[PDB]
């Protein structure tokens, strides 16, 4: 229920993908500016310094763009990763040994990566990490870093 992110009608994949981009881009204008990402990129997904994602994605600067992410994602390792790949990925990165249940519940992959990187609500089909914050933290950190860097 917001124009910015999460619109009420039906959660489309674009609003979702821009939402996880919006994790960095506070105002969600389609591109994150350096100031917008200040704590956000660094910690919220890079868990240290966002120089990696900023200078890897843009290269010359620090601006990340939703549609550009869309194009990047389709060209990145993430969009190529099938369920098996994502399963080993989710475990080795997200540290969620609930993989059996979750993959059999929703069948995740490179599409699911951005779709699950936003809120527990989306990803928890039935039973998947009781801890909301711990769930969304692990998933957003690794899924988002995966859709962004890969």
Chain residues in the site for Ca ion (CB under 5 A): 25, 27, 29, 36
Please state the closest distance from residue 140 (CB atom) to Ca ion, in A: 18
- Closer to Ca ion by CB, 18 or 136: give it: 18
Please state the closest distance from residue 143 (CB atom) to Ca ion, in A: 21
Please state the closest distance from residue 79 (CB atom) to Ca ion, in A: 24
DSSP 95-117: --TTHHHHHHHH--STTHHHHHS
DSSP helix/strand/coil, 65: strand
- Closer to Ca ion by CB, 40 or 149: give it: 40
- Closer to Ca ion by CB, 25 or 145: give it: 25
CB hemisphere CA count around 147 (13 angstroms): 31
In the annotated binding site, the residues are 25, 27, 29, 31, 36
In the annotated binding site for Ca(2+), the residues are 25, 27, 29, 31, 36
CA–CA gap between residue 130 and residue 39 (Å, rounded): 27
Contact by Cβ (8 Å): 21, 15: no
């Amino acid at each position: 229920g917001s124009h910015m992110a999460s619109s009420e009608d039906e959660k489309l994949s674009f609003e979702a993908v821009r939402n996880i981009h919006k994790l960095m881009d506070d105002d969600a204008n389609g591109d994150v500016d350096v100031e917008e990402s200040d704590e956000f990129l660094r910690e919220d997904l890079n868990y240290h310094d966002p120089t990696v994602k900023h200078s890897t994605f843009h290269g010359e600067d620090k601006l990340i763009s939703v549609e550009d992410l869309w194009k990047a994602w389709k060209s990145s390792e993430v969009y190529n990763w099938t369920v098996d790949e994502v399963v080993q990925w989710l475990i080795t990165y997200v540290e969620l040994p609930q993989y059996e249940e979750t993959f059999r519940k929703l069948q995740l992959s490179g599409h699911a990566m951005p779709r699950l990187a936003v809120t527990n609500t989306t990803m928890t089909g039935t039973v998947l990490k009781m801890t909301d914050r711990s769930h969304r933290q692990k998933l957003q950190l690794k899924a988002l870093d995966t859709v962004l860097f890969g």
